[PDB]
Amino acid sequence: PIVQNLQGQMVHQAISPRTLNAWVKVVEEKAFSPEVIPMFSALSEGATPQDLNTMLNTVGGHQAAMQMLKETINEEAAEWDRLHPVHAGPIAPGQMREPRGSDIAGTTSTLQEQIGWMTHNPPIPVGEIYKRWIILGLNKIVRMYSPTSILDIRQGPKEPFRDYVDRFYKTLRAEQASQEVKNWMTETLLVQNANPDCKTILKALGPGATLEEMMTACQG
Amino acid sequence: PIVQNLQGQMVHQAISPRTLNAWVKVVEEKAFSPEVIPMFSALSEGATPQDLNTMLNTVGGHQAAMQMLKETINEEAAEWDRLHPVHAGPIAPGQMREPRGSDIAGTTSTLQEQIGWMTHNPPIPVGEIYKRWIILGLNKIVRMYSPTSILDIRQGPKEPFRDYVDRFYKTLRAEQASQEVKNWMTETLLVQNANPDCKTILKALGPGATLEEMMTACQG
Amino acid sequence: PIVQNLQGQMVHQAISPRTLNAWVKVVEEKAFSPEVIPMFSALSEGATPQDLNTMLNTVGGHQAAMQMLKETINEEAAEWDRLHPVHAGPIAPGQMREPRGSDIAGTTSTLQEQIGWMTHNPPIPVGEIYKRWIILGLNKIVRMYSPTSILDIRQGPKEPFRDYVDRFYKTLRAEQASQEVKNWMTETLLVQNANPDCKTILKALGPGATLEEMMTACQG
Amino acid sequence: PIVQNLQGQMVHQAISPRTLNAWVKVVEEKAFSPEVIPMFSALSEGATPQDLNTMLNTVGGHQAAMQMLKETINEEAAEWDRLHPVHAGPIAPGQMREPRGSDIAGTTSTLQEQIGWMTHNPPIPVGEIYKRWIILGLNKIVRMYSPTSILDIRQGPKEPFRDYVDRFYKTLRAEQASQEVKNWMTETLLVQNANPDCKTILKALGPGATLEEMMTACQG
Amino acid sequence: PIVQNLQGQMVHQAISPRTLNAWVKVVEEKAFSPEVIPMFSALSEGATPQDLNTMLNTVGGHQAAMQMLKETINEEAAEWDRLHPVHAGPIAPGQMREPRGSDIAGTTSTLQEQIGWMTHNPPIPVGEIYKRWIILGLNKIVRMYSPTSILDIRQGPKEPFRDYVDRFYKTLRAEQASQEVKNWMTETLLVQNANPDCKTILKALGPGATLEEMMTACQG
């Protein structure tokens, strides 16, 4: 990827085989859990769009998600084209023209054009826009592979509350909603879907008590 | 992460995938035990807060611990905001203001801000403050993860004292207290809760005896 | 670890994850035995006391030996303080006084003090003294961890002498004693604790000889 | 003890019979409580070692503790001799040496020598050192006569908590541990060995509050 | 305490043995009566903080009261330190730094320093502040030691009015509340909790009857 040289300037480089192999194996091995979203951003920082496409195309199977993300990328490119008018006219060398809906995805842009965009002043974070589009695609993939919603989790009659709250938060991180709704649901559902002793302890503690005191007092 | 270059200035470096994989596997597989706390400082030396956040959020399972750590990070950010008042006025030329509560967590600051802060003169160890906050969170989560205290541990009559003193030290190191309190515990409770035969042998030997003669006294 | 640049100065560096991972794995899978003593000395060359204590604290399990070595380190630090002249008062500019008992253990002294001491003129081998203290602690630990003594081993009627002498030397190597008594005992009872047929064969060979002849005759 | 006189001169006061009678009666009434430590320091403040030794000799009964404190006073005299340079022979005019352990014990030093030491510039508070030795002796004696420890205090189901905490604080005051350890034990042991009803009341209230809030809720 | 000295500054004098004997006997006789509040002030007229500490440490029994008074002293000292300006930097002669929590408690300040504070210009009433703090502590401890509320006192048919009014007023003198609600209670409950005959007599007389008038009316 784009790696800074030893006490020098930024230079282009290819993706190391180890990183892409680790990415593809960790993607294919277990599942499309939400934890792939951070790890992806831990392996595709400062990378040109064509290398993103190369890393994307190496997935074994799960082509329905690939079609989903391709369609979302196409529609986002169309939205970008319609919102931002095309700047026509002569274009000076070194600072190329505005990228189009196909140039951002890198399907028509070449390596030299991407390097020029990266080194262009003012900076062009087209790779970052493609990365955030991939992030949205991964979010909707997690939505596709979500086993169930949050509105049906109920703690077992004798199940310890530790696993209950752990799986509740595991499902919560995969939910797609606003932050305020997430705060409201984590304040309400936790006390409304607990065992009688734990919920009586909760109501004795009253509102405004964080989960720390809740699950240190409900112990036993 | 952040590593100084040989015969050159410090330069930003991408995160090694092997380090992240080793961290996540060692966190997920063994336990939430104290020995992982030093290992963290081995794998987090000289890193931006974004690197620490990425390392933290890549763990699978145990999301209650992650929520607790996030809440403690938020409260420590509030503490930093209250101890250090928000300085208004224009930004000094080439001297960005001190990071805010949301800036140390990295949720509202771009990587360039931390890159500038690390190399700024005088240096700003905001990443070290975030690392210490994470260390405090790890300490409290490993405290709550300990299922048993040290005041109720008892030795069975039908097993050697080896594993009993082993688990006594496990519980002793899993609790956070003053060094003098730990010395008092390891001076009193190591002999006040042993098997009766070993207790009488050690009473005959008298106080002020090292652990080696204690274990070699009543072998078998 | 801190390393010297070729024809240059001495620059501090972090411990590579490979070394720590290998050390913890070999500690886990190769429960304390004499051959682990050299291994540590092969993985601690040019390492600061902070690195030594970090790799020491990463161990999992068998914390009784860890407390024993911590106590021996404390008592050796006290001996160093009481023997080596402790200087106080004014300190010459550009120089710092020798590390104290708490400084050699690394509990109080900061990493910068260790870096300055290592690069000082003349250099201070505080790290090597701490390493040799750890070596003595490991020696007494492996002495403690001896499954049995050395004068009680015998040879079964259906047991070939090969694994007999193998376990004999394995137990003998775990003995902390002078070399002369080791040679004296390895020349007399090694036959007295064997099977009668090869015993009488060796006795007919003559009192004392090179062990290659004594094993070739005992073959079959 | 020597008492300063207003608008006059520093004059030694003969030991009045009132103080001796009060001390002997307060010794004979209980003879075993931490209260001897303050009261003694109120009855012998600013007194020469001769007066301290006379008051020690006047009290009778329980000669085992008296012999123990006398032999420890002898060992303190020996350590005082050995820690400080033993002065001998002629002394410089207008100056006097630090009295030895035998001299400070009140056996080989007459009253006029004590008065001269007190009136010297700088003053020599040998009486204060002897008083501190006596205080340490009383502390270790009441340690030797403590009938019960602090980890075995169990409150009966019908036993009121007021007398329980009273005797608990009695034993804690009888304890000569560190101040921080005393704070830790007052924070933990008071609730670790409490009745289940008040234990649950305190758990609902929230650990970390004043003991007055504990007692106001543990009533009944 | 501090005795008046002519043609010179006042010099502190030790507490007389008879005064402390009277103090301890009046403590041991009742230990919870409100009449100890004046008796304490009559003995501590201008007493140094060291005398107050010694006389507070000479009371035997009910160590919970000592713990509560010590903790209230600590919190009041912290409040005094935080509210009163913290003197820092160059402390010129003629004044002194603010006594801290331990300094105002006399455990980290020599007696000569306290004497100089008492005779300072302007004088520092450290002893008076400690006296009022321990007076508040005594008030709250005697509130604790009062086991009966004021709304349940009733004059029984076989109970004479004299005993009823005497115990009512004696408990009122140990009650801590507003003066207006005190007046309301002493004008309502005294006629609401009497025998019916002189209840009707007092109702016929009307509110505003003195103790002598009501006691003569209820005679018979």
Ligand SMILES: O=P(O)(O)O[C@H]1[C@H](OP(=O)(O)O)[C@@H](OP(=O)(O)O)[C@H](OP(=O)(O)O)[C@@H](OP(=O)(O)O)[C@H]1OP(=O)(O)O
């Ligand atoms: O990090 P180091 O201890 O210096 O070892 C590195 C590391 O290999 P390992 O992670 O297996 O130790 C490199 O891999 P990356 O960290 O860059 O992913 C590898 O680079 P290659 O993957 O390109 O082989 C490099 O080898 P080289 O110096 O030949 O580039 C090798 O150094 P050593 O070969 O000296 O152990």
